[PDB]
Amino acid sequence: SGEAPNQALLRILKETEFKKIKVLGSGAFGTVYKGLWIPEGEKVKIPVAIKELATSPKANKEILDEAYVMASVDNPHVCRLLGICLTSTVQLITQLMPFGCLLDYVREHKDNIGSQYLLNWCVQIAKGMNYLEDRRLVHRDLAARNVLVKTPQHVKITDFGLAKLLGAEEKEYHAEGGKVPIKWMALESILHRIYTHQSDVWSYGVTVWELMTFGSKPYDGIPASEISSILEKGERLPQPPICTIDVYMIMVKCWMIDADSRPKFRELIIEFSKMARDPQRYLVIQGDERMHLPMDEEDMDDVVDADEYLI
Ligand SMILES: *CCC(=O)N1CC[C@H](n2cc(-c3ncnc4cc(OC)c(OC)cc34)c(-c3cccc(OC)c3)n2)C1
């Protein structure tokens, strides 16, 4: 057959099964809460995040599309849907990520993030994105705000509100309209509404730059209108102060014009894993050693553990 059957299970949760405890956020999406989910008949309590909206027919369709994608993913670096609650306003239930988004975590802990953390997050994001490539899914919205922090040692990719799955032979995705985040998009996406896994790599590059700059806004002050122009000339984001040319060289490769010349997510896992084995050699951070967030063979330079070598 053309493609494999998606036998994932969509779990439906009774409103009684979970207790809403506090409001976490409220924005463009709607309203996210912190809660606890006690599966009936079990002696278990699960810290969860709940998303509800305001009832529009197109709004529910978008929520259910995100639910379809989140329910089909199973990876340590991807957020998974626990279930949906079908009350008058539909509720999505995910695992609580206590530390919130990575963009607000780097901004808040700017003077306590060591090179070992930055490089470990780059590896973890590349692992989640590579798993999404294996599952023929193109995210289309990879950014530091769409990466959650379970613990400072473990992050996961979220926000499947724009993600499109690809058919076994379909290699590109031809979008038509909608509010798209311009400062993270590949040049093909801006000019021709084309999205591949290689356009995700471009957004991975911008995400890494956001982390290396501790939350700086890309192309700050410059409007979306002339951002396409700047990229066409040959201008890219500047080299973050803490970055050695090795780290910045990888970012610049993510931003090539030829999508096929950009690195693959499996290559990004290898490169950043090598760097995480000697972090102070690739990121120069003011007081790198005194920071805390809550060899038998000859040349150990290109040594990579098999768990990071994926084909
Ligand atoms: C900085 C990022 C941000 O504000 N976002 C809001 C919309 C996006 N998002 C985040 C979550 C979410 N998921 C899990 N745990 C969270 C914990 C938080 O604080 C402790 C938190 O604070 C805002 C957000 C968390 C969700 C989300 C929640 C439930 C379901 C669902 O999708 C089906 C997504 N969305 C990033």
- Which residues are marked as active site? 141
Please name the fold of domain 18-95: Phosphorylase Kinase; domain 1 (3.30.200)
State in Å: Cα 157 to ligand 1 middle.
11
Q: Specify the pairing of strand 137-138 against strand 81-85.
A: unpaired
Return the exposure string of 211-248: e unless at least 16 CB atoms fall within 10 Å of the residue's CB, then b. Answer: bbbbbbebbeeeeeeebeeebeeeebbebbebbeeebb
Give me the residue label for tokens 């066409």: 232
* Cα(39)–Cα(267) distance, integer angstroms: 40
Closest CA to 311 of 142, 149, 134, 143: 134
State in Å: Cα 91 to ligand 1 middle.
13
| Fold match flag (18-95 vs 100-308) | no
Regarding the beta carbon of 173 and ligand 1, being less than 6 Å apart is answered no
* Cα(143)–Cα(207) distance, integer angstroms: 5
* Cα(272)–Cα(265) distance, integer angstroms: 11
Q: How many residues does the chain have?
A: 311
Tell me which DSSP letter residue 70 carries: H
Q: Which two tokens stand for residue 195?
A: 């999205």
Closest CA to 163 of 78, 88, 105: 78
Q: Which two tokens stand for residue 292?
A: 């805390």
Residue 110 C-beta-side C-alpha neighbours within 13 Å: 8
Task: Please state the separation of Cα 200 from the chain's center in Å.
Answer: 10
Closest CA to 251 of 301, 197, 207: 207
Tell me which DSSP letter residue 238 carries: P
Residue 194 C-beta-side C-alpha neighbours within 13 Å: 10
* Cα(47)–Cα(150) distance, integer angstroms: 11
Biggest CA pair distance of the chain: 64
* C-beta separation of 274 from 234 below 8 A: no
Regarding the beta carbon of 91 and ligand 1, being less than 6 Å apart is answered no
* Cα(241)–Cα(205) distance, integer angstroms: 16
Give me the residue label for tokens 């700047």: 230
Q: Experimentally, how was this structure solved? A: X-ray
* Ranges of H-type helices in 182-264: 187-192, 197-212, 227-233, 245-254
Regarding the beta carbon of 101 and ligand 1, being less than 6 Å apart is answered yes
State in Å: Cα 268 to ligand 1 middle.
26
- Domain boundary assignment for the chain: 18-95, 100-308
Tell me which DSSP letter residue 112 carries: S
Give the class (CATH, top level) of 100-308. mainly alpha
CA distances from 172 to 63, 194, 255, 302 (A): 24, 6, 18, 34
Please give the resolution of this entry in Å, rounded to 1 decimal. 2.5
Closest CA to 305 of 282, 276, 273, 281: 273
